[PDB]
Design a protein around this ligand. Structure first.
Ligand SMILES: N[C@@H](CCS)C(=O)O
Ligand SMILES: [Zn+2]
Length: 709
């Protein structure tokens, strides 16, 4: 049984990767010292592989993003960067003032950099795969270069400001692109490379037959090379086309989906090919029952095994996690432990090992037995709207903000090591500024998920369970290990105090159930919807307590509402059914309670009918970057009647937008939609901004409002 593994985290057990990058950028280490920090990590990764599997990947230590690496490889360096000068240019492309766009990588919380294709002519600008291959070879260690495939590369890229995803957009570019891959592979083979790991996750997207016609052509051109093709994150819909590719070895992800298995059972698997069975989950941290996996492997008839998807979606090692709830650690397995699982699975399958590891009722029942009426509020919007508008007495074009305020070094220090003082001062400033609806600033919160994850039962947090989000930024995902419930009030202290300082309405501030799940690990042996409902009910407990304490407005932040959706559109209806229900459980509030849903993602076009089913009264959106055009989905929706909070200010920029810059967005929004619907707010929270920027911007949106009235 040939064991593969791929995507082992690059960050190191003490986040040496992060320290190396940030030291280099700050300039306190040299370029040579940086390369040495990276070489240490290279060896660290390879040692982990060597101890556990048969095929050792190289070309995995990307200095910022592997999709950016692929772009550099094929000479896709946009004109604005000038000549490619190495690390200096690489990092300017990654994190500079004119960096490539950053976006989520498939349905994961890793963010890649979007290549911008300016010329139809690719060339081999840099051969990193050979460089890494020779680095290890020179040490007497054979490795298989890990590369992004040509189809996936184009599928992840943009040209003329839009995706390159129609078959008639990809054809000509593929011919030129493949020429460069051919050159890279020839070089590898000429230097004795025996196997190359080619990653084609885009095979699992919604593709058309015309796509597969192009893919076949591509791989016919590369049929002379020792390629093993990987796919993951979902099933490959055109199974027959995929297994017909002229490649000797083909990997499938048999964990994220049921269709790969069903399809292989239905159509079989070509005798002229070897199946690599992706059977160990790279996205969840649960020890698996190896006896069951072994049976699956046998059923599949696979001669090789591997993780299902890249391991970099997991933390490095569970080893030093010694303050987890009782019994938990024994059920977990992070990246290092996943490699050891593949090792044991290979051993067991080879007959070399015989001993394998074994591996809140009231809340559970309440969810399983929810009344059918649980997913709607007492009164519908029209009736709610009247009651709320009378209770609040807000002017036309009311102004508000999204929740978080700038964090002084003091604020960050104190939390790391008062809140009542910051809240007072923040509420004071808002009043003096002239804002209509106020917030408490979230000074007491590390981030919108962790803050709540730490206060809920059924959820654990780790000490060192770091996972790469992008560049040098890591986060520790919570682990939802059991029934979720809310023992004690989470935010009442802060909001209550806040409201007691002003006659103006202060927002309750909560994070939705879908977002909490999207940024956390959770259990696989429970339906996703059950987990979502459990969390939703726990959040609703907080909502009740807030409105009981006299809070008139409550905001539920659901930034991941679309991000959490399946890769395949055919799976959207089932997903949104529970996502909607979960949100509605959380938002189940009294008619006099005005609910705000904050959803700062880029477009609503394909999901407006789902949004329409949500029980919020106001929805805040990010409209600045699109100059209001994002409103298209809403104005195009016959029957839209709910209030929209229009983002007039890009909070990711330090600039202070002019009254006129804000005005343009609001006016684009009033082309169709009734003025009574419109609120004015920033795109999102202000936690990453400076007070020097925030205060004048706020005064500007207040002034724009008064002007619009
Ligand atoms: N309430 C959060 C939402 C971020 S999506 C904030 O204002 O930072
Ligand atoms: Zn937001």
């Amino acid at each position: 049984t040939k064991a593969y593994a791929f995507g082992f985290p690059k960050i190191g057990e003490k986040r040496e990767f992060k320290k190396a990058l940030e030291d280099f950028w700050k300039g306190k280490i040299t370029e040579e010292q940086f390369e040495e920090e990276m070489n240490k990590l290279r060896m660290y990764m390879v040692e982990n592989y060597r101890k556990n599997v048969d095929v050792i990947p190289s070309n995995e230590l990307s200095y910022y993003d592997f999709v950016l690496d692929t772009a550099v490889m094929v000479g896709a360096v946009p004109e604005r960067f000038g000549e490619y000068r190495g690390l200096s240019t690489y990092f300017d492309m990654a994190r500079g003032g004119k960096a490539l766009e950053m976006t989520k990588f498939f349905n994961t919380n890793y963010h890649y950099l979007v290549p911008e294709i300016e010329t139809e002519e690719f060339y081999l600008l840099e051969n990193k795969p050979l460089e890494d291959y020779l680095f290890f070879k020179s040490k007497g260690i054979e490795t298989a270069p890990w590369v992004i495939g040509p189809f996936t590369f184009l599928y992840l890229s943009k040209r003329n400001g839009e995706w390159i995803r129609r078959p008639n957009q990809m054809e000509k570019l593929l011919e030129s692109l493949v020429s460069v891959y051919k050159e890279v592979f020839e070089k590898l083979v000429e230097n004795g490379c025996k196997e190359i790991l080619v990653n084609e996750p885009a095979f699992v997207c919604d593709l058309e037959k015309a796509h597969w016609d192009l893919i076949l052509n591509v791989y016919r051109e590369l049929s002379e090379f020792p390629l093993t093709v990987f796919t993951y994150y979902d099933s490959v819909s055109d199974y027959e086309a995929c297994v017909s590719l002229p490649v000797k070895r083909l990997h499938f992800d048999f964990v994220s989906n049921e269709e790969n298995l069903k399809n292989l059972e239905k159509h079989g698997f070509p005798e002229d090919k070897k199946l690599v069975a992706g059977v160990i989950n790279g996205r969840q941290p649960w020890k698996v029952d190896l006896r069951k996996v072994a049976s699956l492997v046998e059923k599949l008839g696979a001669s090789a095994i591997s993780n299902s998807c890249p391991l970099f979606h997991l933390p490095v090692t569970l080893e030093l996690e010694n303050n987890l709830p009782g019994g938990l650690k024994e059920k977990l397995a992070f990246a290092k432990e996943k490699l050891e699982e593949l090792k044991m699975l290979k051993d067991f399958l080879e007959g070399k090992t015989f001993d394998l590891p074994n591996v809140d009722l009231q809340a559970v029942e309440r969810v399983r037995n929810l009344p059918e009426d649980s997913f709607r509020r007492e009164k519908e919007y029209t009736e709610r709207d009247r009651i709320q508008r009378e209770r609040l007495n807000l002017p036309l074009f009311p102004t508000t903000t999204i929740g978080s305020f700038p964090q002084t070094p003091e604020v960050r220090k104190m939390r790391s090591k008062f809140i009542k003082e910051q809240i007072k001062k923040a509420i004071e400033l808002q009043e003096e500024i002239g804002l209509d609806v106020l917030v408490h600033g979230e000074f007491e919160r590390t981030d919108m998920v962790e803050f709540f994850a730490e206060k809920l039962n059924g959820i654990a947090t780790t000490q060192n369970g770091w996972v790469l989000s992008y560049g040098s930024r890591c986060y520790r995902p919570p682990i939802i290990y059991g029934t979720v419930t809310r023992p004690e009030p989470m935010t009442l202290k802060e909001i209550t105090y806040a409201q007691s300082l002003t006659e103006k309405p202060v927002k309750g501030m909560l994070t939705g159930p879908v977002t909490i799940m999207s940024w956390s690990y959770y259990r696989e042996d429970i339906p996703e919807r059950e987990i979502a409902y459990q969390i939703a009910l726990a959040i609703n407990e907080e909502v009740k307590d807030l409105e009981e304490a006299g809070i008139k407005i409550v905001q539920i932040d659901e930034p991941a509402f679309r991000e959490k959706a399946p890769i395949k559109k055919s799976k959207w209806p089932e997903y949104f059914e529970w996502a909607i229900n979960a949100f509605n459980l959380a938002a189940n509030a009294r008619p006099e309670t005005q609910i705000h849903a904050h959803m700062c993602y880029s477009d609503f076009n394909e999901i407006i009918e789902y949004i329409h089913q949500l029980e919020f009264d106001v929805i805040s959106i990010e409209a600045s970057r699109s100059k209001g055009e994002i409103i298209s989905a809403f104005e195009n929706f016959k029957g839209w009647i709910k209030q929209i909070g229009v983002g007039v200010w890009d909070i990711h920029s330090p600039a202070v937008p002019s009254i006129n810059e804000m005005r343009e967005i609001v006016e684009r929004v009033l082309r169709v939609l009734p003025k009574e619907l419109i609120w004015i707010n920033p795109d999102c929270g202000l936690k990453t901004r400076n007070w020097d920027e925030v205060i004048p911007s706020l005064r500007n949106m207040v002034a724009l409002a008064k002007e619009m009235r």
